[PDB]
Amino acid sequence: VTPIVNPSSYVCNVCNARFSTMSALSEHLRSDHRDDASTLLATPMINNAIRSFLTAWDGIRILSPDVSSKHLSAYLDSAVANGPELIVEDTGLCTSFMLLDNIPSAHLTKELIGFTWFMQMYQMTPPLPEGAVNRIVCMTNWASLGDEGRGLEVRLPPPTDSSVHAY
Amino acid sequence: PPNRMVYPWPNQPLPRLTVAPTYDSAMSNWISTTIAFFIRVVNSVNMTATVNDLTRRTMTGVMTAMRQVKTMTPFYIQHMCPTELSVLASVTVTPPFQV
Amino acid sequence: MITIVVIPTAHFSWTDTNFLNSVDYRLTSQPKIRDRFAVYAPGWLRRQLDEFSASLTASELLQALQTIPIPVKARCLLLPKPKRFAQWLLDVPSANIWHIPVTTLRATVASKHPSSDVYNYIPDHVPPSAEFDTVTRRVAAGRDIYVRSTKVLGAPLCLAAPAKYYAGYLSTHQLDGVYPDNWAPDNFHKREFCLTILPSLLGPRTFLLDVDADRDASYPLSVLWPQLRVLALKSRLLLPPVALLRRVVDPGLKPTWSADSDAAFRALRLSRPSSASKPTGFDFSALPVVDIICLFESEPDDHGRVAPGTRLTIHSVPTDLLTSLSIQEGVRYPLRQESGMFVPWVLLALLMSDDVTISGTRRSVKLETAHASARPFVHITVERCASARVVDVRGSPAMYANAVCLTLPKGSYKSTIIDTLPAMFSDLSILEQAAVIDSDALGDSLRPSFETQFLERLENLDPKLLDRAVASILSPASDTSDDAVTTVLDVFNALYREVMTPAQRSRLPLLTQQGRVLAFAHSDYELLSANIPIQVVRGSIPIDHVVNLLARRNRVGGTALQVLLDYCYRTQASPLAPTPAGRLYKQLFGPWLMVPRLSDPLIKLRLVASAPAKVLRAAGWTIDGDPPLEVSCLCAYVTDRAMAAALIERRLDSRALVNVGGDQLMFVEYAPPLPLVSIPRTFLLPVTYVVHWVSPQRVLLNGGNVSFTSGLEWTFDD
Amino acid sequence: EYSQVPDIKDPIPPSAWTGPIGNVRYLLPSVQGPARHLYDTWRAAARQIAQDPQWHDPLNQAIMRAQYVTARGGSSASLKFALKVTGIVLPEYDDSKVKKSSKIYQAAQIARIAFMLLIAAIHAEVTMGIRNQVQRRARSIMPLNVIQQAISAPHTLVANYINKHMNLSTTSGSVVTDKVIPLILYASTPPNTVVNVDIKACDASITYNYFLSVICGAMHEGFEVGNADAAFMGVPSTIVSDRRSSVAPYSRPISGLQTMVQHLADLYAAGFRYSVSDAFSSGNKFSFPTSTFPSGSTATSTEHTANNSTMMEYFLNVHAPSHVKSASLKRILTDMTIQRNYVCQGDDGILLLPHEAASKISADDMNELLTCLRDYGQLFGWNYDIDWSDTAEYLKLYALMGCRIPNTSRHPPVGKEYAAPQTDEIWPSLIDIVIGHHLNGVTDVLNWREWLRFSWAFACYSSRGGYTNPKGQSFSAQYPWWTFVYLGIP
Amino acid sequence: ANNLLNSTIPISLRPTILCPWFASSEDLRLQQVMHLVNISSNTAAALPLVEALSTLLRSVTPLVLDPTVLTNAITTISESTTQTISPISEILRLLQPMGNDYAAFWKCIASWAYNGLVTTVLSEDAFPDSSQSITHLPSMWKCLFLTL
Amino acid sequence: NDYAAFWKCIASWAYNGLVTTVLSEDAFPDSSQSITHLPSMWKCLFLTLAGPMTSDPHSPVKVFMALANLLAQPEPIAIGVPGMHQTTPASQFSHPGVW
Amino acid sequence: TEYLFYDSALKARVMKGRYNWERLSSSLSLNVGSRVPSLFDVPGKWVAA
RNA sequence: UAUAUAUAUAUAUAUAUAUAUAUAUAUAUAUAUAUAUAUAUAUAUAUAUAUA
RNA sequence: UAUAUAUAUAUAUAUAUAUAUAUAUAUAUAUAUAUAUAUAUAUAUAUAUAUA
Ligand SMILES: [Zn+2]
Helix, strand or coil, X not given: CCCCCCCCCEECCCCCCEECCHHHHHHHHHHCCCXXXXXXXXXXXXXXXXXXXXXXXXXXXXCCHHHHCCCCCCCCCCCCXXXXXXXXXXXXXXXXXXXXXXXXXXXXXXXXCCCCCCHHHHCCCCCCCCCCECCEEEECCCCCCCCCCCCCCCECCCCCCCCHHHC | CXXXXXXXXXXXXXXXXXXXXXCCCHHHHHHHHHHHXXXXXXXXXXXXXXXXXXXXXXXXXXXXXXXXXXXXXHHXXXXXXXXXXXXXXXXCCCCCCXX | XXXXXXXXXXXXXXXXXXHHHHHCHHHHCCHHHHCXXXXXXXXXXXXXXXXXXXXXXXXXXXXXXXXXCCCCCCCEEECCCHHHHHHHHHHCHHHCCCCCCHHHHHHHHHCCXXXXXXXXXXXXXXXXXXXXXXXXXXXXXXXXXXXXXCCCCXXXXXXXXXXXXXXXXXXXXXXXXXXXXHCCCXXXXXXXXXXXXXXXXXXXXXXXXXXXXXXXCCCCCHHHHHHHHHHHHHHCCEECHHHHHCCCCCCCCCCCCCCCCCCCCCCCCCCCCCCCCCCCCCCCCEEEEEEEEEEEEECCCCCCCCCCCEEEEEEEEEHHHHHHCCCCCCCCEECECCCCCECHHHHHHHHXXXXXXXXXXXXEXXXXXXXXXXXXXXXXXEEEEEEEEEEECCCCXXXXXXXXXXXXXXXXXXXXXXXXXXXXXXXXXCCCCCCCECCCHXXXXXXXXXXXXXXXXXXXXXXXXXXXXXHHHHCCCCCCCHHHHHHHHHHHHHHHHHHXXXXXXXXXXXXXXXXXXXXXXXXXXXXXXXXXXXXXXXXXXXXXXXXXXXCCCCCCCCCHHHHHHHHHHHHHCCCCCCCCHHHHHHHHHHHHHCHHHCCCCCEEEECCEEECHHHHHHCCCEECCCCCEEEECCEEEECCHHHHHHCCCCCCCCCEEEEECCCCCXXXXXXXXXXXXXXXXXXXXXXXXXXXXXXXXXXEECCCCEEEEECCCCECCC | CCCCCXXXXXXXXXXXXXXXXXXXXXXXXXXXXXXXXXXXXXXXHHHHHHCCCCCCCHHHHHHHHHHCCCCCCCCHHHHHHHHHHCCCCCCCCCCCCCCCCCHHHHHHHHCCCCHHHHHHHXXXXXXXXXXXXXXXXXXXXXXXXXXXXXXXHHHHHHHHHHHHCCHHHHHCCCCCHHHHHHHHHHHCCCCCCEEEEECCCHHHHCCXXXXXXXXXXXXXXXXXXXXXXXXXXXXXXXXXXXXXXCCCCEEEEECHHHHHHHHXXXXXXXXXXXXXXXXXXXXXXXXXXXXXXXXXXXXXXXXXXXXXXXXXXXXXXXXXXXXXXCHHHHHHHCCCCHHHCEEEECCEEEEECCCCCCCCCCHHHHHHHHHHHHHHHHHCCCCCCCECCCCEEECCEEEECCEEECCHHHCCCCCCCCCCCCXXXXXXXXXXXXXXXXXHHHHCCCCHHHHHHHHHXXXXXXXXXXXXXXXXXXXXXXXXXXXXXXHCCC | CCCCCCCCCCCCCCCCCCCCCCCCHHHHHHHHHHHXXXXXXXXXXXXXXXXXXXXXXXXXXXXXXXXXXXXXXXXXXXXXXXCCCXXXXXXXXXXXXXXXXXXXXXXXXXXXXXXXXXXCCCCCCCCCCCCCCCXXXXXXXXHHHHHC | CCCXXXXXXXXXXXXXXXXXXXXXXXXXXXXXXCCCCHHHHHHHHHHHHHXXXXXXXXXXXXXHHHXXXXXXXXXXXXXXXXXXXXXXXXXXXXXXXXX | CCCCCCCCHHHHHHHHHHHXXXXXXXXXXXXXXXXXXCHHHHHHHHHHC
């Protein structure tokens, strides 16, 4: 039967090391498992080559100017017979920034009762974030509506995360 | 200059009524003079010393016949072909590129 | 009545009961929905297009067809030759509706050279000295037309007169082809929508359906697709298939006025409650598939928040795979297994899909499934079905029932599909593991394995040269780096040519002459260099194999020999466009996945071939009973006994060359190769099969090896 | 014979190709070497073929279709199966007493059908035959079916243009075979140095992994210049997916010529599938595929002669000067070109050196030259089988110092080929055998007086014959000797 | 269309139309230059342009090429049959209709539209050999054709 | 058809301003056609005869322009309406401003 | 013939030529029965072969 | 005092079944209108046969 | 030309069949609302058991 609950921890095959996150396990496999100089060709230098290749992998980029270089393309008569997609119309909210709930407010039930009031208690969606700490972030077309859109967007996580990948 | 095209031959606007072969177009003039020149060549002394006159009489004959054919092409070049180019220049995927 | 012009996609099912289903089967889910559509698209028009396809440019063809009204009320009335035709106006005098003189008629009867006079001055007569558009212009008038040739376009073509005049003037098949048109008409009805394969002027009430897939290359009008698409694009007339399900049409996704949250939209709920006792108890050639958009997410941050994540489009995954696994939309399933690998069902979805792209753009990506990427995905959610249509499978990637070989790069997940999938059922006979041929089998056969021998030769080289080669292969920008890699390639080529080829050639019957073989290879060259008569399909999977094999550490080589072998095979492989391996998987396993959806039990079959007892005894075999022995070559499945028996009377024109050794290793060979399309599409075959005696107790002692020939005959079994 | 595959010493790396165009891949501009030369040559020829109103002339179209039909033929059974398989009910004319396997018979069946419906049948089995030889292995005859022969038309056309417009087909126009006689005589004269070359097995060495893929790509690209929607020989234009750009893939129409290439490349990559049914052996028919080119008749000479010329030209102008050592050799190797220094036909070829001034080239340089050529052929898997003996071997003719040498052993007085277990002929045919036999003894210069005497004796025996009904009567006859005088015997 | 196919529009309210279908010459000039940058400047670039235009020209034209009247007017010339050379045969051996329906003529016309990119030249083979004399009739005819 | 067209015209008279009968578009000759093309000439004859029966106020102009179109070449008059030409299809004129 | 005469122009050409030929050969009285090479007989030659 | 399990009661949500009301679709029956086909009768026209 | 017969076409009438539309009745399906029952989940109360 298909699983429905994520693993509580992740396991490497031989090191018996258990990890709370698969990312941590991934790094352990990425680094610690891969020195192992024991064969006729398991040299340290190739281990570095493999290690570099592992770190350098990214196969889900929209733009890839590195590999697009030297893509000499010949002019074709039929190719230019498409026309650009000019008509794109949106019925959603003309906005590109989102208010966030970066730190949720605590649910007090024994002491400090009444200091907090969630609109959910009245079955209402609040018009503003009601977290302990609220941030403004850039998430293009977060309220878009009507059709698919251009297909490339900018989405930044709250500053509690790295957000490095955007740059 | 934009929206203009150059043309190796002289040209005219499209005729009004029905067409017909003519003999004053530039090309027709070029043909006639060319034939006339070669006929003069055939009768030059250089040919007479070596070419039997009967054959020479024949050769000038056939050249004469060519000069008298009522072809339509010279008229078409001067009057109708430019229109076809002018229209098609707006159709080809690549606009004309002239010097 | 809004009209939607439709251009079929790559593997559009045509013999379907309803053309509508191949468009998007969701439209058939509700009676309230299916009642809103008309179809038209008549067969006679289809045949005409098939013929004229080779004689008109796209622009001309579009220009000619675009003016035709929806129900074609006109007919083309072929006239017989004047000598024949003239007699008609006197056989029935009132039929001389043009009142051609009797004198002229019998003058024609007398003349050695009957002239066109009988045709002359007849209104709307089309001589052979005419063109396609001449017909089409008259078609817009709705009245019937009189013609003097069969090659006409736009209207059904039927005889004007009884067949007696056209006989002799035309031949049997020609005289046959006009019969449906002789009584052509059928009514067309005024529902909300009407689909059509006939093009039309795009406008406020006419729309072009966009499915986001390649056209049917064989369909004659696919050439019109660019011009039509661009014209629709410049006026915003494309319709995504989902728009059809809404109560009112609009081009767009996520509209304001509709949440698009209804059972009709959910393509995963495939249901089949109705029945008609039809011979197709199931048509195992028609397969419903879906294109889905799935959201992938990584671990949350230290405060429970999560990154925006990414959504990808998976193409043409068979729907029954998801349904049988109880997959549901809007559910965030866990993506990663205990050991960090993907959960099996996701891998199956990827393997049987055609392509994976970024949701928005049209860039195809090869997905990684190892510990390479940082912040790796741990959760997956299917969001919506971009399209959901049935597709024809019969004989598409592979052609022969005998066997087929699929080539994949090293490191593919073939083990999962061949083991986990049948194991996930393990109740219905899918295949025999003894029949599937692992690509590594022959390499494992040599007493020192081919890998060991390659390693042993390889180490003789200087280590630095090897190190330089490996780094160059990994580093994409390292163009050629001739010295290091070429040296290794020479060793590889020399060894492979030396040892692998004869060993491969020594296994010829094992690859093909069994019941039904499914085989894997690292390159087509592995077979061509050995002259093995088996179809080879150059497949590809939408996952990065290089990184994948970089995680397999328990091997003879320390993960470095593997990449070397991988590069060598890829270099060895012939340059050609490879196909998605999912299509082949769909052809093989697809039909089986629909088994649990069935309502009635299956019925087994086979095509046993006889064996005279004389040759067996002559070969020293000890056998009881006189009746000739028979051997099951291949078993099949149906569910309607009636039509199944009705189809069992065909005599296959393919002999069997049975061969069996004393060790009871049994082999079969079809002198005329048995093609899959010859199998009636109501049948169902196992992925692999092993030939065997139908009654092993008949034999009492295996003599020497035996060979014989016999015919083939489908038969029931109990 | 067909168990051989060429060994390439420097295969084209997979990274040297562009994205697929449905089946074919174009060659990256950055790639150089002989392959680049081959690619450009075929591409240029394809361009010239592309725009050519010589075709679409209805008369010319008739010539091509008519060229495909002969009294012989084969693979008819495969044809009937494949089309019957696809639901196509072909006509039959058995009462008209004509062999089904004749290429004529299958052609008649096809006449009515729309061509595109037949496309699935091109991937069908091909029968084979064998013709024995006097001084070598037996030859092979591999007749394609009419449909396959039609599809391969672009390959032939481009090859013809390459031949007729580069080195004037090196005598492959075959107008009168005697044009090679003065050629070899001149080539064997003292002032000239000549080298005999020939591909070891051109039929077995031409293949898809290296050669045909390049040609298919070049032809497909070379046809790009032309109306994308222009049917050719009933093959309409179609839509194909272009994947050269990973960021902007799409689909565009392609002309019928390109569609032919798309299928043709598919067939070549799949490899030919032959079916052997030898009668001399007992109950052992089977089928197995191979990359060996059919090469059953003169229709193959065009392709091999084109590739032969191309590789030789690149070797002379590029590879050799960059690689040879002797300065004198470089001096003489330059100022040399195929159009006036090299001829060929299929595998066979002749190379003659420019007249060394009142002198001859050092055998040392010759050895250096010949060695480098062997390596050059080894690069892409051609065994060149060259030799240097100051004689002329071309199309089985031998010349020594400008004197022709008839190799009589190749025409044995008693020997005659028979490719079947039965002679299957009737008595009067022996006369024609005698006439043909006598002429060889004249073509080859034998002792004319004694040869004539022997010939008449042969005629006398042949002059008489008889026959018997399968059950009934016998019959007999014989000619008066004056017949043979009329037939051409003095 | 050079004022052919004259047409006009109705006169009524058209509230919310939008037809973004136009650009300045500078845009066109820029695109044309860009198009010229993305090609191999050898014949490979020019050929599709000339071929396409030539096909369009031949597609729509009232002119029809037919040499029957010329030959009919030539073969009617009387000459002695006792001579060893008949220049009529020499002429008719030339002017050989290659069956291509004179693609060269349309090819030359099309080339004018792109004269700034490609030039049509007379083929080298179609020249009289420099070793000949004026009395060599085939040479003289060749020179005549070149002049014309 | 019982000449229904004829009766429709008469009926439309009593309801003009609510519905107007017009000469069917297909009835006009091609404006590029010449007067010599006899079927075109007869079409103009029919149009001229039937003109007054229609309720369309622009029928007089349309009838006139039809003949003017066929006489474009032999009778090149100047039309003082910007944006129009003697070769313009007759059925297009309509609005009074372009009389 | 159908395979040979894929189009119609060739068939029209041959038929016209044959009709004119026999008409001329008989009327001009050159001779009758002259087996002149013509395309209509090419299929006949094929059949005989 | 808290947690967990089991039983019973009450409240809320979801699914299924049954009843009633309203809307939509389909099928069947009856009535009316329109169209098409076939048969019969009458009238008119045309063709053919026979008689004068 | 006239009479009689037969065939075909057109018009009108009558009958029969089929199709489409509208009305009325009945049945079934789907959706929505309300009521009742059962199941599952969650909360609260009470009882019993076990643990702390
Ligand atoms: Zn570990």
